[PDB]
Design a protein around this ligand. Sequence first.
Ligand code: CLA
Ligand SMILES: CC(/C=C/C=C(C)/C=C/[C@@]12O[C@]1(C)C[C@@H](O)CC2(C)C)=C\C=C\C=C(C)\C=C\C=C(C)\C=C\[C@@]12O[C@]1(C)C[C@@H](O)CC2(C)C
Ligand SMILES: CC(/C=C/C=C(C)/C=C/[C@@]12O[C@]1(C)C[C@@H](O)CC2(C)C)=C\C=C\C=C(C)\C=C\C=C(C)\C=C\[C@@]12O[C@]1(C)C[C@@H](O)CC2(C)C
Ligand SMILES: CC1=C(\C=C/C(C)=C/C=C/C(C)=C/C=C/C=C(C)/C=C\C=C(C)\C=C\C2=C(C)CCCC2(C)C)C(C)(C)CCC1
Lengths: 201, 196, 152, 41
Amino acid sequence: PDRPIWFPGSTPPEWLDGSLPGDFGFDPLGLSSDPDSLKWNVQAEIVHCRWAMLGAAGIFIPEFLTKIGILNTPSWYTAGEQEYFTDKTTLFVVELILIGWAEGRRWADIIKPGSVNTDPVFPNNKLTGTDVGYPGGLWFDPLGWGSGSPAKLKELRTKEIKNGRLAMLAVMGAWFQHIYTGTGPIDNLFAHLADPGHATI
Amino acid sequence: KGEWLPGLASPDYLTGSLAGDNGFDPLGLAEDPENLKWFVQAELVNGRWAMLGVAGMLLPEVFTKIGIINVPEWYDAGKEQYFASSSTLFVIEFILFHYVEIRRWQDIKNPGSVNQDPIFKQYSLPKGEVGYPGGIFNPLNFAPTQEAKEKELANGRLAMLAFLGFVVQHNVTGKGPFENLLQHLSDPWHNTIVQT
Amino acid sequence: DISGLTPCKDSKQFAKREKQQIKKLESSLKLYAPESAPALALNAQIEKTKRRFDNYGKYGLLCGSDGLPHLIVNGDQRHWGEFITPGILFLYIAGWIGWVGRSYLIAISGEKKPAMKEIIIDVPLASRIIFRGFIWPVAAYREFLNGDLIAK
Amino acid sequence: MRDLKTYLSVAPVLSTLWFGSLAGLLIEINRLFPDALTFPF
Ligand code: CLA
Ligand SMILES: CC(/C=C/C=C(C)/C=C/[C@@]12O[C@]1(C)C[C@@H](O)CC2(C)C)=C\C=C\C=C(C)\C=C\C=C(C)\C=C\[C@@]12O[C@]1(C)C[C@@H](O)CC2(C)C
Ligand SMILES: CC(/C=C/C=C(C)/C=C/[C@@]12O[C@]1(C)C[C@@H](O)CC2(C)C)=C\C=C\C=C(C)\C=C\C=C(C)\C=C\[C@@]12O[C@]1(C)C[C@@H](O)CC2(C)C
Ligand SMILES: CC1=C(\C=C/C(C)=C/C=C/C(C)=C/C=C/C=C(C)/C=C\C=C(C)\C=C\C2=C(C)CCCC2(C)C)C(C)(C)CCC1
């Protein structure tokens, strides 16, 4: 109730009580009024955050090293037009099959929690997670930092959520910068730092 | 028994008392018990025919790797000449299969009503299930436990899928089934359903 | 030659019709520069007309004395594509639609206020029912055999 | 919003969406395969 709010002096929506990690009461359109939509949106936000962080790393770290000359990798924008050892549709089909198996078990855990926690082949192996969206276990949590007191869990999940939101914004920014300026994302930063007054849209 | 899709609840009419029951019926064809009774026999017969068909399509073609015999491929065997015309063989097959399938059909309606030989009255099949005749049809006296029935049904389903693959592949590729496997094994990453 | 008809590829009136249409299309092309977009559109139209006439010639249709194709619906195997196959496809699709509608109507008949579920569609139930109509012939035949199809 | 989803299930809106998708599909099919008079396959 006394948590910081996105709009100081306003009243947060009723369905946002601050229990969820990274909660600031921002929901002007009320897209998650009923609980089912709230759970679905939480899962979607977590997935989007993690995918976006991976994408941001894979876009920005390779492009940084290419500019300074350690590697000679192509642009992320045109990385899809190179020729590889096989046709792109074959890679797309392999990806579709593998990620369909991977995400299929994730869909079942959302609908019916606690039903896909056992290894189909070797029953001796199990996932130790208890929350939807945080599978846990040795496969996904080898270091054992994913379990503990509620305060630690809330702090870690808030950190993850905020970092994921920042990564989503950064990825969208990089895409639009390459669309408009027609130049690599790292070049834009150096151009801005050269003439901060004038290096602008 | 097992679940064809974890996280989804099995239908109530699939109680697991049948062999090879994995609770797979998304479209609800077997809601009526009579429909399930008919479809079990239909699946059994279709699989039993499909396994023999697949064995007759694949094995008489693997000769090329061994070079023992010389037989045309499965889609060209019809055009070959034989000691009798197609019409006579078709008529004889019709005449025999009519009696065979009419005899088989009567057991589904009234089980235990066709267990006695029609000519030699002292010969009869021992009582059994509807789709598992036994008796003379089981000369080696293998015990028909549930495990063997599940193995039979799994093999039948796999053979149905194999026959569908055999039919579809020839239509688009124009060759037999064994050379398609060899072509794939030559360059796996370039020879798939995606030709490019 | 059923009923005195002739093949499209052997009909002179068919070629005359094609030539007349092409000549009519080419007259308007002379009013525009070759690089202009209307010239490209007219060229595409001419190419489409030629392709359509060639395709009609290839499919083995029958032409009358006026140079127009005619359809045979008597059941000859040489013309099963004009009426028989599209008819079977239409029958399958219409049976699918009717079976889906009947199943949805039957499903909501036991509710307290069934008239309310007809103006405000229960989307999940309909979506779960939609895929079921792909095997409508088997379900209809078995329902007829069990005596469930007709109301008592 | 539950009340917003309820308004999307009313008969006219659902009919309009269904028929728009249907017309788009038919127009695209006719664009890909123009001037069809007989079933050739
Ligand atoms: C993390 C987000 C982020 C960051 C750090 C940047 C940074 C930059 N952008 Mg940019 N951008 C972003 C998102 C972002 N953008 C998004 C989402 C879009 C799509 C609308 C764009 C579209 C865009 C264009 C079209 C151009 C830039 C350009 C630039 C560079 C010059 C500064 C400028 O004019 O910015 C302008 C930035 C915006 C108009 C987007 C608004 C800022 C977003 C909302 C994030 C706000 C910052 C955040 C709240 C503060 C905390 C994070 C902080 C630690 C960075 C600079 C390196 C210019 C360039 O190439 O430089 C030479 C340029 O021409 N950006
Ligand atoms: C989510 C998102 C945008 C978010 C939108 C917002 C804030 C909406 C906010 C609101 O809803 C709230 C909160 C509440 C509502 O009441 C009001 C509104 C206002 C409606 C962006 C990105 C979302 C998604 C992202 C970032 C996707 C990432 C993509 C990846 C992983 C790309 C990877 C690769 O780049 C590599 C690594 C290497 C390359 O070679 C190849 C490729 C494949 C290109
Ligand atoms: C019998 C058979 C093949 C038999 C072949 C025979 C005898 C002979 C072939 C020959 O080669 C020889 C030997 C010699 C050659 O010279 C001549 C021929 C004649 C060529 C195939 C069956 C093949 C049978 C098949 C493929 C059946 C598939 C069924 C499926 C997939 C059903 C799925 C579902 O029904 C469920 C289970 C549940 C529902 O709720 C949902 C859905 C999804 C609808
Ligand atoms: C021969 C022929 C002809 C003529 C005639 C005819 C065709 C007649 C009749 C027919 C018929 C007569 C059919 C059918 C029948 C049926 C019955 C016997 C019963 C019943 C039915 C029903 C009732 C149905 C219903 C339904 C369904 C199932 C689906 C969906 C919808 C509905 C629900 C409606 C022609 C030349 C044209 C063509 C060729 C062939």
